[PDB]
Write a protein that binds this ligand. Structure first.
Ligand SMILES: [Mg+2]
Ligand SMILES: [Mg+2]
Ligand SMILES: [Mg+2]
Ligand SMILES: [Mg+2]
Ligand SMILES: [Mg+2]
Ligand SMILES: [Mg+2]
Ligand SMILES: [Mg+2]
Ligand SMILES: [Mg+2]
Ligand SMILES: [Mg+2]
Ligand SMILES: [Mg+2]
Ligand SMILES: [Mg+2]
Ligand SMILES: [Mg+2]
Ligand SMILES: [Mg+2]
Ligand SMILES: [Mg+2]
Ligand SMILES: [Mg+2]
Ligand SMILES: [Mg+2]
Ligand SMILES: [Mg+2]
Ligand SMILES: [Mg+2]
Ligand SMILES: [Mg+2]
Ligand SMILES: [Mg+2]
Ligand SMILES: [Mg+2]
Ligand SMILES: [Mg+2]
Ligand SMILES: [Mg+2]
Ligand SMILES: [Mg+2]
Ligand SMILES: [Mg+2]
Ligand SMILES: [Mg+2]
Ligand SMILES: [Mg+2]
Ligand SMILES: [Mg+2]
Ligand SMILES: [Mg+2]
Ligand SMILES: [Mg+2]
Ligand SMILES: [Mg+2]
Ligand SMILES: [Mg+2]
Ligand SMILES: [Mg+2]
Ligand SMILES: [Mg+2]
Ligand SMILES: [Mg+2]
Ligand SMILES: [Mg+2]
Ligand SMILES: [Mg+2]
Ligand SMILES: [Mg+2]
Ligand SMILES: [Mg+2]
Ligand SMILES: [Zn+2]
Lengths: 100, 50, 119, 86, 71, 52
RNA sequence: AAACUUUCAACAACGGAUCUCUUGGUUCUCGCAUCGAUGAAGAACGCAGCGAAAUGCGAUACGUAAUAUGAAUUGCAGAUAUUCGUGAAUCAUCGAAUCUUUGAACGCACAUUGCGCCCUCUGGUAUUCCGGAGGGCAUGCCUGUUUGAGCGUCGUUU
RNA sequence: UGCUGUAAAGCUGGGUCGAACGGCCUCUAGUGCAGAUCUUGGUGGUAGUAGCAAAUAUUCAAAUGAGAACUUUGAAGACUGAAGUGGGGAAAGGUUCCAUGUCAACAGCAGUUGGACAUGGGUUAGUCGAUCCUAAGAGAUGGGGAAGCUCCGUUUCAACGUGC
RNA sequence: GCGAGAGACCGAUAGCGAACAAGUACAGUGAUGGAAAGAUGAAAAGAACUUUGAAAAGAGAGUGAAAAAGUACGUGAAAUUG
RNA sequence: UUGGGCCCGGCUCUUGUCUAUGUUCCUUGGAACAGGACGUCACAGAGGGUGAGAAUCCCGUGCGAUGAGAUGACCCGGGUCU
């Protein structure tokens, strides 16, 4: 059961694993249908953009301080500084975050 | 037995009517594959289980 | 191929029931002759004629009940829509479109705008 | 005498025809069907007998009403009659 | 069956399985305008019901059989 | 192949002492399938070795 | 030497391999959301001019209506069936119907085609008995209606 | 019919046959059988062999038929011997009943015969049974358990008549 | 479940148990168990007729491209057999 | 900054109808759908059928065109009435 100078392995296959094997044969089909959904969503509301405007936020932790990324929504203070109400902002393609 | 229920006697009537040979004009139909009745039953051989 | 359904639809209750009786004695007479012929294909025609007259009688009586109950709140369940059990339990359009006065004020105050970018 | 001689004393049916499934599994003294579970409201079925589900399930009979639900759904559950073309 | 039409003044009919002797007696009166002395019924080995209808002495069953048209 | 091909049987080995190979066999009676071997890659109607 | 045994070849047997097919299976992907007390799924019994099964259907019974289409069906037979047409065949389509006895299965019961009761009509000299036709009578729960119960309890009168 | 290769094998003559198939460069795998008391199917020797020996027992003639140990009829000889090899039924079977036709298979010989095969016919009730009653028992309801499938209980801590 | 499109998949002992009147026939008191079974030919043209036979059949003949395709049906291996 | 109802469109879904070019010659064959010659169409040389391997014989395929039915407070574009 243990033989030769080999690494000791951890192969977690002692349950009925073969009943829970998900093979992604539909990767290309899902890519194509996802693109079609995206076209339909865009053509429904054109020329209004499909994406809400997102803020830019620093990533948390000491490992990702340096990076900056897209947040979830603009804070109430930020929208206040440009004179937009959050209820109104949500209707002109601007995302709001009451939590930040 | 002679003393039988209606439900029993009704099953025995259907069993008699299903126990007939194939009508011969059926073998003349186009693309016909049935040569004989394959569901025959003799009283002594196979029991009805009723 | 027997009687014509459009000719039957122009008849009264008494004329349709009278013709049904005549068709049944014809079918009864044919079954007596079937004892000796014995092959008698005309039996098929009379059997489907009885079905047509019975159909027209039943259909004619059903718009009479439909006309009686037209616009009423409660009608017989065989005259109601027969979509599915689940679709009948579903909220009506009026009930599904019900809205609180608070929710109606906010929908009106902030409709989805129509806009574009880069101008 | 537990073989051939004892087999001659078999003339008392333990089961008769079931009214629900018609199978001859209705235990006379228990008044229960060993096959469909009649007269219980639910049908007797077990996940340890998948072949038994095959024998009696939707599609093994006529489906005299589910036959047509797909065709009625496809037409949006129409009410009314077809209109003759001019 | 035809020996009964002649000797016993009895008409033999195939009858619906669900009908009783009261309904059979009425039916022959309405269809053939004839009075039944009695109706003896029977379910056959093939699953159909047979009725022995004896007519009263007012009617001659042989004349009725010709009127229906099977003798 | 089907995940249950060759395994839709309640076959049980007869054991030794009956002058037949110890392969599992179909139970019951009254059909010609009864007493026939099952489940084996060498058996007619069994599942293949290492099903795909 | 025959016969017999064995081997081989030819032809013939026995048997159904091989080859070649394939309206089937298996696996993958894409799309959709639609069973039932308005009685489902399932069961039993029936139904055709001549059918046992399978398929279809329910006493309107291998189907009725409707829409479309446009000359068949076919094994045989046959129209009181049809052809420049309300017209052959058609689960082509399908929106109107029919839908036996059952089944969650619902008057009670069911190893019984057992036994009630109510309403309207009808036959037998009948509010009461017997017969027939049609329509009804399950349970839990919700809203409401009506009729009630309890010194639980309020007001008033001796 | 031969040729080539140490070989696994390849090619070829003749016969049969009837709809697809091969060489080479690569790819791929459910890829090679003598065995597994292997699996499924088929076939032998055994072998025209073991055997077809309980229940006393058959025979003559005619008829029928292509064909008669076995069918039918007659004559005889026998047996069961009324706790029957007689005449009915319950359970169980389900058309085996009856008539006509009929012999491929089945009736471990035979077959003109049959519980076989084919086509028809046949089961008649106010009084015979079921139906009704209750028995040991089974089991809804009101309730009480149980996550629940369901368990207990049978008038039960119930406002219990579809009353007459 | 419904509706589609596919494959370096299997090719009738394989592939679903089931390519067929398959969850059928059949077994079991019951829960359940559960097969075998595809292929004449382009077309039945499925062999009229004569003859021997009680008949089944055979021999002539006939159809067909082929009967070295006769439904005991394409090809028709081996065991086994004349 | 702004309410509601209908009417026609568009979108979505389903469905009907409509469409290029050899069956020319020779050989084999029972049959040409095989071989050869000369071609034609092709936004169609996918697939199937027809007496053998058929783009051109048939259905289809490709390209689109044009009707019918639906459906949508919670899709938009116009009208139109409040
Ligand atoms: Mg470790
Ligand atoms: Mg026996
Ligand atoms: Mg009686
Ligand atoms: Mg397999
Ligand atoms: Mg092969
Ligand atoms: Mg009883
Ligand atoms: Mg050669
Ligand atoms: Mg060759
Ligand atoms: Mg060929
Ligand atoms: Mg190649
Ligand atoms: Mg292998
Ligand atoms: Mg071997
Ligand atoms: Mg073997
Ligand atoms: Mg042997
Ligand atoms: Mg001997
Ligand atoms: Mg002996
Ligand atoms: Mg004698
Ligand atoms: Mg004696
Ligand atoms: Mg007899
Ligand atoms: Mg014998
Ligand atoms: Mg013999
Ligand atoms: Mg018989
Ligand atoms: Mg009595
Ligand atoms: Mg009674
Ligand atoms: Mg008691
Ligand atoms: Mg309770
Ligand atoms: Mg496929
Ligand atoms: Mg198979
Ligand atoms: Mg198999
Ligand atoms: Mg073959
Ligand atoms: Mg002769
Ligand atoms: Mg040949
Ligand atoms: Mg051949
Ligand atoms: Mg052959
Ligand atoms: Mg050999
Ligand atoms: Mg074209
Ligand atoms: Mg071809
Ligand atoms: Mg050419
Ligand atoms: Mg082609
Ligand atoms: Zn049951």
């Amino acid at each position: 059961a243990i033989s030769k100078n080999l690494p000791l392995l951890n192969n977690h296959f002692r349950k009925h694993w073969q009943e829970r094997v998900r093979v992604h044969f539909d990767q290309a089909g899902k890519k194509a249908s996802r693109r079609q959904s995206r076209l339909r969503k865009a053509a429904k509301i054109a020329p209004r953009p499909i994406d809400a405007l997102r803020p830019v936020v620093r990533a948390p932790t000491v490992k990702y301080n340096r990076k900056v990324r897209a947040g979830r929504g603009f804070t109430l203070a930020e929208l206040k500084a440009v004179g937009i109400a959050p209820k109104y902002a949500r209707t002109i393609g601007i995302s709001v975050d009451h939590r930040r | 037995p002679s003393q039988k229920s209606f439900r029993t006697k009704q099953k025995l009537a259907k069993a008699q009517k299903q126990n007939r040979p194939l009508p011969q004009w059926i073998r003349l139909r186009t693309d016909n594959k049935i040569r004989y009745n394959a569901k025959r039953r003799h009283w002594r051989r196979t029991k009805l289980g009723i | 191929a027997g009687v014509k359904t459009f000719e039957l639809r122009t008849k009264s209750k008494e004329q349709l029931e009278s013709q049904l009786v005549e068709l049944k004695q014809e079918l009864a007479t044919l079954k007596v002759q079937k004892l000796q012929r014995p092959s008698l294909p005309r039996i098929h025609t009379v059997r489907k004629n009885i079905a047509r007259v019975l159909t027209v009688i039943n259909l004619n009586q059903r718009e009479n009940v439909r006309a009686f109950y037209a616009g009423k709140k409660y009608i017989p369940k065989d005259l109601r829509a027969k979509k599915t059990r689940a679709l009948r339990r579903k909220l009506t359009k009026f009930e599904a479109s019900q809205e609180t006065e608070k929710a109606r004020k906010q929908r009106i105050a902030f409709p989805q705008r129509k806009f574009a970018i880069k101008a | 005498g537990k073989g051939t001689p004892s087999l001659g004393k078999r003339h008392n049916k333990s089961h008769t025809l079931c009214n629900r499934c018609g199978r001859r599994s209705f235990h006379v003294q228990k008044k229960t069907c060993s096959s469909c579970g009649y007269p219980a409201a639910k049908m007797r079925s077990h996940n340890w007998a998948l072949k038994a589900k095959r024998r009696r399930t939707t599609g093994t009979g006529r489906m005299a009403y589910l036959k047509h639900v797909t065709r009625r759904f496809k037409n949006g559950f129409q009410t009314g009659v077809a209109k003759a073309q001019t | 069956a035809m020996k009964k039409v002649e000797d016993g003044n009895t008409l033999v009919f195939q009858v619906d399985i669900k009908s009783n002797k009261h309904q059979i007696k009425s039916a022959v009166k309405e269809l053939y305008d004839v009075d039944a002395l009695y109706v003896n019924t029977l379910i056959r080995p093939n699953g159909t019901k047979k009725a022995y209808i004896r007519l009263t002495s007012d009617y001659d069953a042989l004349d009725i059989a010709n009127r229906i048209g099977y003798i | 192949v089907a995940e249950n091909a060759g395994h839709q049987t309640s076959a049980e080995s007869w054991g030794t002492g009956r002058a037949v190979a110890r392969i599992p066999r179909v139970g019951g009676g009254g059909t010609h399938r009864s007493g026939q071997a099952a489940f084996g890659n060498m058996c007619r109607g069994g599942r293949m070795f290492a099903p795909t």
